[PDB]
């Protein structure tokens, strides 16, 4: 989270801290149900052993609502290839039941047609997580959130040396230093609609953090809503 400000207590409930063997978040987590956590499938290449400390608000110290949850199994996409930049999504079934409480409330799927007609057609989107407070600044001690706007397809294509597929879309600022960064690995990025935030995607890659001419390479949630549900029912 380059720049930005802290998630107020309860403002980012689905947001989770995937605590690894050393219990420090190697990835941004996303509460999905009483037993499920969402992260990008890139997080699977960074794990010795890992848990989900839902409700965490400060990496410095435990300050309320921190319940440790253990991933039962990961639903990795079978077409998930790093080169495609696509399907970078890993649904994390949990052994420990997620207890819906303060700072614990997931983000569920809207109508696929309505999501395509409304979610990706919005103006800005909100990203949260214990991310790098600057492009390279230190990881956000507090749970810091940030809002980023949508980017046109051609702008993302010219702004990327690589493919901008039918799903991936840029979101951020042309030169302003504010976006998701190291710490938002699978960090939940949402979009407000009548106070109901909708996860419109999560950065996968990109040149630096909110660099000049660069943007977060988000994943079109509406593209794989059917796959998101089928992985909700998978494993």
């Amino acid at each position: 989270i380059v720049g930005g400000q802290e998630c107020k207590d309860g403002e980012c409930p689905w947001q989770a801290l995937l605590i690894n063997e050393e219990n420090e978040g190697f990835c941004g987590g996303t509460i999905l149900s009483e037993f499920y956590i969402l992260t990008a499938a890139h997080c699977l290449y960074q794990a010795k052993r890992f848990k989900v400390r839902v409700g965490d608000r400060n990496t410095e110290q435990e300050e309320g609502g921190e319940a440790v949850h253990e991933v039962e199994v990961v639903i990795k996409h079978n077409r998930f290839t790093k080169e495609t930049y696509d399907f970078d999504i890993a649904v994390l079934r949990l052994k420990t039941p997620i207890t819906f409480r303060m700072n614990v409330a997931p983000a569920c799927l809207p109508e696929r047609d309505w999501a395509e007609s409304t979610l990706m057609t919005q103006k800005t989107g909100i990203v949260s997580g214990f991310g790098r407070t600057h492009e390279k600044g230190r990881q956000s001690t507090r749970l810091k959130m940030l809002e980023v706007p949508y980017v046109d397809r051609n702008s993302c294509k010219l702004s990327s040396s690589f493919i901008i597929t039918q799903n991936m879309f840029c979101a951020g600022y042309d030169t302003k230093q504010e976006d998701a960064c190291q710490g938002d690995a699978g960090g939940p990025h949402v979009t407000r609609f009548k106070d109901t935030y909708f996860v419109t995607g999560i950065v996968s890659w990109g040149e630096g953090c909110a660099r000049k001419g660069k943007y977060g390479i988000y994943t079109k949630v509406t593209a794989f809503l059917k796959w998101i549900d089928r992985s909700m029912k998978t494993r």
């Binding site: 077409r79 397809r153 051609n154 990327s160 796959w227 089928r230």
Partner: protein
């Protein structure tokens, strides 16, 4: 967009099948494969006018292989008009299938208004709009022997018209029913 053709006889050979086209690319991520392989690259719109009674192979084409005797038939009821035709990329407008693409796509075009139009033509997309640097056209005029390379933000579902606002009876039936659907393939295996 910059074309190429022959030199042995410009008039009769352009009237013949001697024309081609390439792109002068400032592109970076192409590697001869694709300018930026993230937008559709359907590019060519060539409403060129060819008179087969002006072609270099007028003789064999018109005379030996038609339903008429071996006369050139410049003078005519309409054969100066029949053998002349404003085909679209080697295909006549009346016998071209409708286009079709799925949504969320951008089609990177590289047009070529090369035909002897003698009158600038103004294409138009129903609902869908063009790009011109920053400007958005939605109705683009054309000029002879010039390449036009822009994209289109195809943003309206269903079939839509690649129609011309000039709509002169000379080159009137120019409307391509390009479709737009929400990318039917659910992919992702299951």
């Amino acid at each position: 967009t910059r074309p190429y053709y022959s030199d042995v006889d410009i008039m009769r050979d352009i009237a013949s099948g001697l024309i081609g086209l390439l792109l002068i690319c400032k592109s970076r991520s192409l590697d001869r494969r694709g300018i930026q392989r993230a937008a559709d690259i359907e590019q060519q719109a060539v409403f060129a006018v060819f008179d087969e009674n002006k072609s270099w192979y007028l003789e064999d084409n018109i005379n030996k292989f038609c339903e008429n005797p071996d006369e050139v038939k410049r003078d005519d009821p309409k054969f100066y008009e029949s053998n002349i035709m404003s085909t679209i990329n080697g295909y006549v407008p009346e016998s071209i299938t409708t286009l079709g693409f799925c949504f969320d796509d951008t089609v990177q075009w590289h047009f070529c208004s090369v035909g002897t139009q003698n009158e600038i033509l103004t294409i138009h997309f129903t609902g869908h709009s063009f790009i011109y640097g920053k400007r958005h056209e939605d109705t683009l005029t054309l000029f002879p022997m010039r390449g036009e390379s822009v994209t289109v933000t195809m943003d309206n579902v269903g079939t839509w018209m690649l129609t011309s606002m000039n709509s002169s009876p000379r080159s009137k039936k120019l409307r391509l029913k390009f479709r737009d659907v929400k990318c039917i393939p659910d992919d992702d295996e299951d």
